Write a protein that binds this DNA or RNA. Sequence first.
RNA 1: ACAAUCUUCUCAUGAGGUGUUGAACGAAAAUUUAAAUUUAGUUUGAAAUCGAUUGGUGAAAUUUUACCACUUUGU
Lengths: 184, 208
Amino acid sequence: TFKRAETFINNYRQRERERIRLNRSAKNKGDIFVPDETKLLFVIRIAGVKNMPPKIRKVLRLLRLSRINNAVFVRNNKAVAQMLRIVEPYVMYGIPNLHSVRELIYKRGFGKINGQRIALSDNALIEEALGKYDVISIEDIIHEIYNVGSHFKEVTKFLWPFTLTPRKAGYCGEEINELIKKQV
Amino acid sequence: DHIIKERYPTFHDALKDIDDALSMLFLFSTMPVTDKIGAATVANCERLCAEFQHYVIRSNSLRKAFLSIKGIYYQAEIFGEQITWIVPYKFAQFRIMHTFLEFYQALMGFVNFKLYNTLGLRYPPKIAGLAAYELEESNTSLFSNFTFFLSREVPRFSLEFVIRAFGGKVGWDPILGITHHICDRPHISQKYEGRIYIQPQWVYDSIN
RNA sequence: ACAAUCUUCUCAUGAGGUGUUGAACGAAAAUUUAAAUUUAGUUUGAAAUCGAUUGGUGAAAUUUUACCACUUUGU
């Protein structure tokens, strides 16, 4: 449709607002919050606003948030924090409680095997694809993801960016399970 | 209330016609939550299914348990009437369905309240699976008192609930959900002290 | 979508805090190295009829930064 001039200015203001927060938080504020209580999170994307800063665009892609509500098993450590804080305005990070991960895997589990949404319905699919990864079933997937097993990164690659379609632009902790409960 | 009274002249008619409602509730207890369905409705259906399983466990009304391809078929005798329910497996798989589910949930709640009153249990029960739902008071011996255990490959909680329903004490791994070791594979090594490798078919055959 | 993260302080006792519409008028000093910054000041409607500084830096896939600024642009 016909875009009105106010929308273009609103994009510029948000961009300048987005650019500023990025400049403060990253440069001269290298200190990071280091999320804890797990080795695995369930980050989701609230809304990637149009015309992102080019820094932002891969942060969704690399940690697998290329689409909205993409809940992914990410290795919880200091390393993800700065990248997530780069993308923190558009994401919610929270802990995948065992029930939430199991419930997600049991019903909404569509693991991105070969980059496609492959349902985790059959425990053999987890067993066959993750035989060397020690994940043998949906319950074992939770042990390898929610409990972040030895091959959690491989399990996460086996897993998918679960679209937990519904959110605050930051910490959730157990609130990711709340979204997962509604999503799954 | 009035619709259920007209549809079911007596509790015997409701019990005989609750097989479809029980099957629908069990199927919806593990179905994904979408726009067509409601999260609260799914939670209510799961609570009704848990209450029905707990009531069957206390009354030991379960008679047969068959491991079918579609799911677990449980046949129970309540007030003489035979009730058959199908429990689908936990696998990653509309207005009329929602209306039928709502009617089934209302019928299940009324049946659970009547069963709890007859057995003396409080309705609704206070709310780990069935462990959260406390049955506070207000084969029939398939595994008797054998303290069976389940690893993180068998139905675990489903095996525990099915055994506890008829006559058993099957276990469940903490993530998944001694005298026996329930596992998908034989897993002789996984069979712990006392826990002998328990194939689900063997337990189902003994129950049936 | 004329909506969004420009700072209730922070640490440590000191240090910081990252941030300013445009235009017009105007001292008189300094260093830095004429432009470059500071630099008495100012005036006005979020005012508006050329005048552009004109390099660098990356950072993607050479045109693209309409702030990317040397500490110099896609994790």
